[PDB]
Design an enzyme around this catalytic site. Sequence first.
Site, PDB file in Angstrom:
ATOM      1  N   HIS A  87       2.155 -10.813  -8.332  1.00 28.31           N
ATOM      2  CA  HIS A  87       2.747 -10.092  -7.313  1.00 28.31           C
ATOM      3  C   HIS A  87       4.447  -9.418  -7.692  1.00 28.31           C
ATOM      4  CE1 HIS A  87      -0.057 -11.631  -4.472  1.00 28.31           C
ATOM      5  NE2 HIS A  87      -0.081 -12.831  -5.142  1.00 28.31           N
ATOM      6  N   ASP A  90       8.788  -4.106  -3.860  1.00 27.63           N
ATOM      7  CA  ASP A  90       9.540  -2.842  -3.883  1.00 27.63           C
ATOM      8  C   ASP A  90      10.257  -2.854  -2.486  1.00 27.63           C
ATOM      9  OD1 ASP A  90       8.062  -1.967  -6.187  1.00 27.63           O
ATOM     10  OD2 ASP A  90       6.937  -0.259  -4.804  1.00 27.63           O
ATOM     11  N   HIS A  92      12.218  -0.257  -0.060  1.00 23.84           N
ATOM     12  CA  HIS A  92      12.259   1.241   0.063  1.00 23.84           C
ATOM     13  C   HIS A  92      13.945   1.621   0.290  1.00 23.84           C
ATOM     14  CE1 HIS A  92       7.955   2.432   1.710  1.00 23.84           C
ATOM     15  NE2 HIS A  92       7.919   1.890   0.553  1.00 23.84           N
ATOM     16  N   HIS A 127       7.544  -3.861   0.423  1.00 24.95           N
ATOM     17  CA  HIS A 127       6.256  -4.322   0.180  1.00 24.95           C
ATOM     18  C   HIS A 127       5.807  -4.734  -1.332  1.00 24.95           C
ATOM     19  CE1 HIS A 127       4.816  -0.605  -1.592  1.00 24.95           C
ATOM     20  NE2 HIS A 127       5.586   0.072  -0.689  1.00 24.95           N
ATOM     21  N   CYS A 128       4.619  -5.342  -1.417  1.00 26.03           N
ATOM     22  CA  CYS A 128       4.453  -5.847  -2.963  1.00 26.03           C
ATOM     23  C   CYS A 128       3.766  -4.434  -3.366  1.00 26.03           C
ATOM     24  CB  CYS A 128       3.478  -6.801  -3.001  1.00 26.03           C
ATOM     25  SG  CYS A 128       2.768  -7.461  -4.339  1.00 26.03           S
ATOM     26  N   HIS A 138      -2.596  -5.117  -1.942  1.00 23.95           N
ATOM     27  CA  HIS A 138      -1.701  -6.294  -1.617  1.00 23.95           C
ATOM     28  C   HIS A 138      -0.896  -5.865  -0.244  1.00 23.95           C
ATOM     29  CE1 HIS A 138      -1.319  -8.711  -5.328  1.00 23.95           C
ATOM     30  NE2 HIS A 138      -2.504  -7.799  -5.621  1.00 23.95           N
ATOM     31  N   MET A 143       1.154  -8.123   2.436  1.00 27.54           N
ATOM     32  CA  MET A 143       2.438  -8.087   1.714  1.00 27.54           C
ATOM     33  C   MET A 143       3.441  -6.990   2.035  1.00 27.54           C
ATOM     34  SD  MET A 143       1.531 -10.062  -1.799  1.00 27.54           S
ATOM     35  CE  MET A 143       3.334 -10.560  -1.962  1.00 27.54           C
ATOM     36  N   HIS A 248       5.134   2.640  21.947  1.00 25.09           N
ATOM     37  CA  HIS A 248       5.314   2.804  23.449  1.00 25.09           C
ATOM     38  C   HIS A 248       5.589   1.380  24.261  1.00 25.09           C
ATOM     39  CE1 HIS A 248       4.803   4.911  27.198  1.00 25.09           C
ATOM     40  NE2 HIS A 248       4.175   3.793  27.653  1.00 25.09           N
ATOM     41  N   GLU A 272       9.317   8.506  25.608  1.00 25.95           N
ATOM     42  CA  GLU A 272       8.020   7.808  26.166  1.00 25.95           C
ATOM     43  C   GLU A 272       7.289   7.179  25.249  1.00 25.95           C
ATOM     44  OE1 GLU A 272       4.679  10.143  27.949  1.00 25.95           O
ATOM     45  OE2 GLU A 272       5.855  11.921  26.955  1.00 25.95           O
ATOM     46  N   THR A 273       7.201   7.814  23.761  1.00 26.06           N
ATOM     47  CA  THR A 273       6.301   7.222  22.594  1.00 26.06           C
ATOM     48  C   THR A 273       6.933   7.791  21.466  1.00 26.06           C
ATOM     49  OG1 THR A 273       4.351   7.375  24.079  1.00 26.06           O
ATOM     50  CG2 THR A 273       4.017   7.293  21.628  1.00 26.06           C
ATOM     51  N   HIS A 299       0.225   3.650  20.932  1.00 24.68           N
ATOM     52  CA  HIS A 299      -0.277   4.404  22.168  1.00 24.68           C
ATOM     53  C   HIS A 299      -1.588   5.404  21.435  1.00 24.68           C
ATOM     54  CE1 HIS A 299      -0.982   5.947  26.062  1.00 24.68           C
ATOM     55  NE2 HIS A 299       0.177   5.530  26.533  1.00 24.68           N
TER      56      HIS A 299
END
Lengths: 338, 338, 338
Positions: A87, A90, A92, A127-128, A138, A143, A248, A272-273, A299
């Site tokens: 494993h 990373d 972002h 995330h992995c 993964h 993950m 939503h 709304e969304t 939604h």
Amino acid sequence: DLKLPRQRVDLVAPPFVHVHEQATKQGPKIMEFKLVVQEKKMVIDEKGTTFQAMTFNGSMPGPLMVVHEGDYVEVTLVNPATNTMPHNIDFHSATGALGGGALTLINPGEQVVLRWKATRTGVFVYHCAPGGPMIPWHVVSGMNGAVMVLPRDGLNDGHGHSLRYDRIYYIGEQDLYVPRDEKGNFKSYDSPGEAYSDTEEVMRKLTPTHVVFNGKAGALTGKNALNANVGENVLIVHSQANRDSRPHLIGGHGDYVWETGKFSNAPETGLETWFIRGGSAGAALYKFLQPGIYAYVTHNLIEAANLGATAHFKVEGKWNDDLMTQVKAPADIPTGST
Amino acid sequence: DLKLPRQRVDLVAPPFVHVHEQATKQGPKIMEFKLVVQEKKMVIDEKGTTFQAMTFNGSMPGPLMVVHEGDYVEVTLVNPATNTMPHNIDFHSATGALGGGALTLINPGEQVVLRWKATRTGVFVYHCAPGGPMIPWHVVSGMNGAVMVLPRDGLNDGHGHSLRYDRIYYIGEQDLYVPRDEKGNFKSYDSPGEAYSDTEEVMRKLTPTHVVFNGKAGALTGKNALNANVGENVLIVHSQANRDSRPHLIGGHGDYVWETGKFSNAPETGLETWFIRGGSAGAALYKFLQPGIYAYVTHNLIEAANLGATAHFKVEGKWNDDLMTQVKAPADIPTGST
Amino acid sequence: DLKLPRQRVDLVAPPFVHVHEQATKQGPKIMEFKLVVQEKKMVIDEKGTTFQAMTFNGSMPGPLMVVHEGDYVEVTLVNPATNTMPHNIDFHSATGALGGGALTLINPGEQVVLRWKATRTGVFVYHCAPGGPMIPWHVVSGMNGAVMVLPRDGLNDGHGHSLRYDRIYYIGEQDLYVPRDEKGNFKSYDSPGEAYSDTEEVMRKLTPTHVVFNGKAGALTGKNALNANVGENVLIVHSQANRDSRPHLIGGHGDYVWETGKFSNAPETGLETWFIRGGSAGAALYKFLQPGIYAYVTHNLIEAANLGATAHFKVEGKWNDDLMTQVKAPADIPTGST
Ligand SMILES: OC[C@H]1O[C@@](CO)(O[C@H]2O[C@H](CO)[C@@H](O)[C@H](O)[C@H]2O)[C@@H](O)[C@@H]1O
Ligand SMILES: OC[C@H]1O[C@@](CO)(O[C@H]2O[C@H](CO)[C@@H](O)[C@H](O)[C@H]2O)[C@@H](O)[C@@H]1O
Ligand SMILES: OC[C@H]1O[C@@](CO)(O[C@H]2O[C@H](CO)[C@@H](O)[C@H](O)[C@H]2O)[C@@H](O)[C@@H]1O
Ligand SMILES: OC[C@H]1O[C@@](CO)(O[C@H]2O[C@H](CO)[C@@H](O)[C@H](O)[C@H]2O)[C@@H](O)[C@@H]1O
Ligand SMILES: OC[C@H]1O[C@@](CO)(O[C@H]2O[C@H](CO)[C@@H](O)[C@H](O)[C@H]2O)[C@@H](O)[C@@H]1O
Ligand SMILES: OC[C@H]1O[C@@](CO)(O[C@H]2O[C@H](CO)[C@@H](O)[C@H](O)[C@H]2O)[C@@H](O)[C@@H]1O
Ligand SMILES: OC[C@H]1O[C@@](CO)(O[C@H]2O[C@H](CO)[C@@H](O)[C@H](O)[C@H]2O)[C@@H](O)[C@@H]1O
Ligand SMILES: OC[C@H]1O[C@@](CO)(O[C@H]2O[C@H](CO)[C@@H](O)[C@H](O)[C@H]2O)[C@@H](O)[C@@H]1O
Ligand SMILES: OC[C@H]1O[C@@](CO)(O[C@H]2O[C@H](CO)[C@@H](O)[C@H](O)[C@H]2O)[C@@H](O)[C@@H]1O
Ligand SMILES: OC[C@H]1O[C@@](CO)(O[C@H]2O[C@H](CO)[C@@H](O)[C@H](O)[C@H]2O)[C@@H](O)[C@@H]1O
Ligand SMILES: OC[C@H]1O[C@@](CO)(O[C@H]2O[C@H](CO)[C@@H](O)[C@H](O)[C@H]2O)[C@@H](O)[C@@H]1O
Ligand SMILES: OC[C@H]1O[C@@](CO)(O[C@H]2O[C@H](CO)[C@@H](O)[C@H](O)[C@H]2O)[C@@H](O)[C@@H]1O
Ligand SMILES: O=N[O-]
Ligand SMILES: O=N[O-]
Ligand SMILES: O=N[O-]
Ligand SMILES: O=N[O-]
Ligand SMILES: O=N[O-]
Ligand SMILES: O=N[O-]
Ligand SMILES: [Cu+2]
Ligand SMILES: [Cu+2]
Ligand SMILES: [Cu+2]
Ligand SMILES: [Cu+2]
Ligand SMILES: [Cu+2]
Ligand SMILES: [Cu+2]
């Protein structure tokens, strides 16, 4: 060389978030976090379906990490010898080396320590990503999590006004790809490795079997509904590491929404969304105005109701009949109706 | 009637872009381009799968055309007699006649000349659109590219500051729908026409078999990795004529992103992942801060790793340990760990 | 208690919209609307395929309701005794009680009256939401529409300039999930209840069989093309209650687009293609510059051409050869070509 104060943070399980300040007058620190990989079978739906999950810290999603702009984040990633797979991680939020993945690959029985500078504000996925086809596998096995990098002055509305939340919740949404047998029943396996080939076949058709918040259908309903009170400003951080989502709040709105999740950009108002791009986190602030049950969904309502992607808020307070009222309760249609 | 200087542009194959100025003091010109349709069998994946492609200028995507606001764009579209189908062209940058499609339908052995005024700034899709079901089929067979219409003063950050790129790359993403036989093997055909019926059946289920950059899995990896240097500002133009995408530069960010692709709108800053609506182009500027390999993906990681949608950048320079460092290399977990 | 003038509005069938003012000097009113649920078999495609629809006011989408900020909206929802199912209504524009759904559940033979205050400007979805799996099913069976809440000063460009439309159209997009038999032919049923189990199986795979505007493939083509004139500013309201869409006006642009649909946010300018998140409405203003046929599509062109999602505008006026011209009509390729 890096001569800054160090502060250890104890993470908590989602949807809660570890204690932190919004605005701070502290200077930059080295914020120390530990993540421990755990491979384990987990229940993912209300019928008891299991699957071979892979997690950071035993949860889907992984915990939310919160720091401020200009902090350094020093992460110890541990891969216990009870695990079967390599494993890595990373971020972002980080710059270089594939977000850290190129510097954090560890076999079972190993740990590694990565430091990254929090130069970019917002909420971000981590995330992995071990390499090749192992990357999606993964991630869709569980993950992934998120990190929030706050401005040192806290949030603002993009128009010179501070925004402060009373409560924060982190909703991690996970698309799952569970194999079925010829009759349609979900299959079980004794290990992640044994599940891989069948799982990859499902993955390839890009249609999840489940879409869940906090790791299982119904996780954030019933007795695990999220609490709030009328008048409270609540920040809802939403991540999806692999697939788009459209959050939503049923009966509410997004008062201030950063759908792309980055606080250098002014939020949109009164949505709304909103839309979380796969591979990102976003955030929405809402001030509750009415008590009662609210459903928080993606939604695509098929996903929400039939694949697992509904959470509840339970909001205490007094009803406001100015905003909404039942003028006349259900009654028979007048016979003198045309 | 239209008495402006004429300038012939020689297009180049993606991901490169023909020479152009960013800011210009030239006045409007008639910019002359030629596109030649080529139907041909092409290899689309690393296992050698072929499919019956249809292209502008022999490439998927078609080449990027670059002009400035207020230029006129005079396009000669040629359909050689070796082709089997009628073709045309629709420019999302243009106003009227279905973007030009209504004025450019040509049979094999014919050519046509269309002129359109570049009144709208941004990056835009162009694609073939012969009519009815032929529209999606020609597009998903490869007949799409992009055009960029720059402001005459070049790019800006929406806050009164000029932005200049050192390098530009055009990444065209293509969703492909390759038929399979009963055992799952991809089918081959002797002509596009022969492939159509089986291909349309795949298309109808809206799930691609491949998602590729620059026309094939692995096109922009290995020896065809995209080059850059630490400190360079790189513009990455991304198009998708038919289906959404969510670009992400692994280990980097989008410093300035126009996800809807139109330079009359201020860019968003500091994105992790952005969103290209099917039927559009967008663009992201990033200044590299760290050397090494970066993967550029759509952040549906199944698509990226398993369906073909990964490119690489190879970035030369010196590593910055302030931004990121491996504090401790992989090591055994201390026995005195709890 | 609520002592405001009352005004009854007569709704009209989409894509038209009931008469209203843009800017108004009227003060707040109680705007009274009536919606009547109708379950009925409807034709959804050009081959005559039917399905067991459920509608507000006999149409897919339901009608557009138009009010101004600070109005109160008093809706009588009627469920005639000829219907078979309970129904309700949730307004994304409203605050509390699941948008009204928690206060509006009615059995066949009943009606209910809900009032909500229009505190949030924009276009918003409304839809039925009876509970659990019935929520997606009623929505994808046709029970959704939209409401527009205008600022009292009408629209603006976000930069201090008024925007006024000459015409407005409401395009409701519906994803449909029609069961097939073993040979692929669509199945028919005698009631919605009888269709449910087979329909839910299709729904679960998240791939529609049809994607239509105004309730059927071809609804807004041919003699039902939408009319406009060169020089007219046209507002196109687009909703999708369940699934994302990417609107595009072929041969035109979105001059001013609120893709998230909320008028407190400045519009984006000069878009080629925009994005309606499932569970939302958006709106685009365009001033026609050229006469002729325009296609309005979702720019997944498979959906547009093969699943039903194309509308036409027929625009009267004089052609502008400055914007676009056919310099040379189709001709044989010169023999002296290389
Ligand atoms: O006998 C199958 C039946 O038992 C349940 C119990 O809740 O779960 C079992 O089978 C599932 C499908 O293979 C597994 O995912 C699970 O690990 C196993 O306990 C039901 O879900 C299932 O229908
Ligand atoms: O922008 C936040 C943060 O990013 C850095 C790089 O670590 O700067 C990037 O963004 C700047 C503002 O948009 C650009 O001017 C710059 O060129 C780019 O590297 C930091 O300097 C900045 O605080
Ligand atoms: O979904 C196909 C088919 O499979 C069955 C069992 O044969 O149910 C499975 O699928 C359902 C939908 O995902 C699940 O609710 C259930 O846990 C699972 O066993 C059939 O009931 C269904 O028709
Ligand atoms: O908080 C919702 C909860 O409060 C009750 C009374 O305890 O009713 C309130 O909320 C209703 C809308 O959900 C209003 O119509 C009502 O007037 C108000 O008192 C419960 O009935 C409801 O579940
Ligand atoms: O024999 C099938 C085997 O050969 C390969 C060679 O690389 O490709 C052939 O068959 C493919 C599938 O039909 C075609 O797409 C291709 O045109 C043909 O050369 C392998 O891909 C394939 O598995
Ligand atoms: O906006 C760029 C370009 O579009 C034109 C039409 O060719 O104007 C459109 O957009 C204007 C600004 O938003 C609107 O005011 C106008 O009504 C609309 O046609 C050009 O005039 C302009 O340069
Ligand atoms: O995908 C189904 C099934 O088909 C086989 C061949 O029978 O592989 C094909 O599909 C793979 C996935 O797209 C490709 O990698 C390969 O090129 C193709 O022939 C099986 O291996 C697979 O189970
Ligand atoms: O450019 C990446 C490349 O440079 C090397 C040394 O040549 O290492 C540098 O980059 C690493 C991160 O990817 C740093 O940890 C290291 O300290 C730095 O010198 C190669 O190892 C690497 O592939
Ligand atoms: O005989 C089937 C044939 O008739 C059509 C007539 O237009 O429609 C019938 O069958 C359809 C598929 O079951 C139904 O949806 C419809 O209700 C019924 O009239 C054709 O569509 C169909 O292919
Ligand atoms: O914003 C429109 C409308 O929403 C209300 C609540 O009904 O205010 C919300 O949005 C405000 C501005 O963003 C926030 O300051 C406020 O806290 C939030 O409730 C109305 O007051 C306002 O007109
Ligand atoms: O789509 C599968 C298969 O079914 C058939 C009839 O057996 O056609 C049906 O599906 C078509 C695509 O949706 C429709 O155009 C038609 O109305 C429907 O009966 C076959 O023709 C097709 O191969
Ligand atoms: O309005 C489109 C319609 O007008 C005609 C003439 O009546 O042609 C005009 O539009 C064409 C582009 O669609 C121009 O090329 C032409 O010069 C202009 O007169 C029809 O041919 C066309 O369908
Ligand atoms: O590390 N991958 O299984
Ligand atoms: O309004 N919520 O589906
Ligand atoms: O021109 N269409 O095949
Ligand atoms: O961080 N990239 O998948
Ligand atoms: O009310 N639902 O069928
Ligand atoms: O340009 N329209 O597909
Ligand atoms: Cu892992
Ligand atoms: Cu990633
Ligand atoms: Cu073509
Ligand atoms: Cu197009
Ligand atoms: Cu209903
Ligand atoms: Cu809703």
